[PDB]
Design a protein around this ligand. Structure first.
Ligand SMILES: CCCCCCCCCCCCCCCCCC(=O)OC[C@H](COP(=O)([O-])OCC(O)COP(=O)([O-])OC[C@@H](COC(=O)CCCCCCCCCCCCCCCCC)OC(=O)CCCCCCCCCCCCCCCCC)OC(=O)CCCCCCCCCCCCCCCCC
Ligand SMILES: CCCCCCCCCCCCCCCCC[C@@H](O)O[C@H](CO[C@H](O)CCCCCCCCCCCCCCC)COP(=O)(O)OCC[N+](C)(C)C
Lengths: 69, 57
């Protein structure tokens, strides 16, 4: 029965090791992403949560019929 | 010996020679804040996929 239907314990052991490594890395990445989201939304100094401002290319830099703009 | 200007001459844009230096900050502007740095590097696939609950892709 063992020879026909089942493998040795090492296969399940090392597959468990691989699964545990993947899951632990995913958990750490989730916590890191939450912290990064919090910091980026608080400071606004990252790529995320960038809200539009007025384009400076819309300004007319011409004499304006009055010396003081 | 004065000659009256012709039509369209007083409205010309002329050039003037002056020794007055060109002002550098006529608006009295402050120093502009520095921008967010940049996006750099090559794009790699997301580590372990979406990582959304039970999904492995
Ligand atoms: C002809 C068919 C064919 O060509 O087969 C090729 C293809 C070969 O792909 P493979 O890389 O060899 O498959 C590896 C394992 O199957 C395992 O592949 P995997 O580990 O990459 O899993 C793919 C992954 C991502 O794939 C999916 O999310 C879609 C899977 C459908 C979910 C099943 C619901 C209904 C069926 O699935 C999940 O993340 C699991 C989430 C599923 C739950 C969905 C939520 C609803 C709740 C349940 C109701 O076979 C299949 O697609 C399997 C049949 C489906
Ligand atoms: C000889 C008498 C004394 C001893 C009697 C012992 C009784 C044992 C027989 C009863 C069957 C046990 C249940 C079967 C469960 C096994 C299913 C699965 O886990 O096994 C697969 C093996 O597949 C087998 O083909 C299972 C087939 C069993 C299906 C039973 C069908 C019986 C139906 C009855 C029909 C009779 C006639 C009908 C007339 C209409 C594994 O696939 P594999 O990916 O390789 O695994 C790798 C492991 N290796 C490396 C060791 C190979």
């Amino acid at each position: 029965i063992a020879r026909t239907f089942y493998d040795g314990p090492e296969k399940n052991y090392e597959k468990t090791m691989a699964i545990l490594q993947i899951e632990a890395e995913k958990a750490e990445l989730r916590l890191k992403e939450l912290e990064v989201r919090r910091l980026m939304r608080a400071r606004g100094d990252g790529p995320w949560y960038q809200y539009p401002t007025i384009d400076k290319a819309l300004i007319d830099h011409s004499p304006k019929t009055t010396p003081d703009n | 010996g004065w000659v009256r200007p012709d039509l369209g001459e007083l409205s010309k844009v002329t050039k003037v020679k002056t020794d007055r230096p060109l002002p550098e900050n006529p608006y009295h502007s402050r120093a502009r804040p520095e921008p967010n740095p940049e996006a750099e590097g090559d794009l790699k696939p997301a580590k372990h996929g979406s990582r959304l609950f039970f999904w492995t892709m």
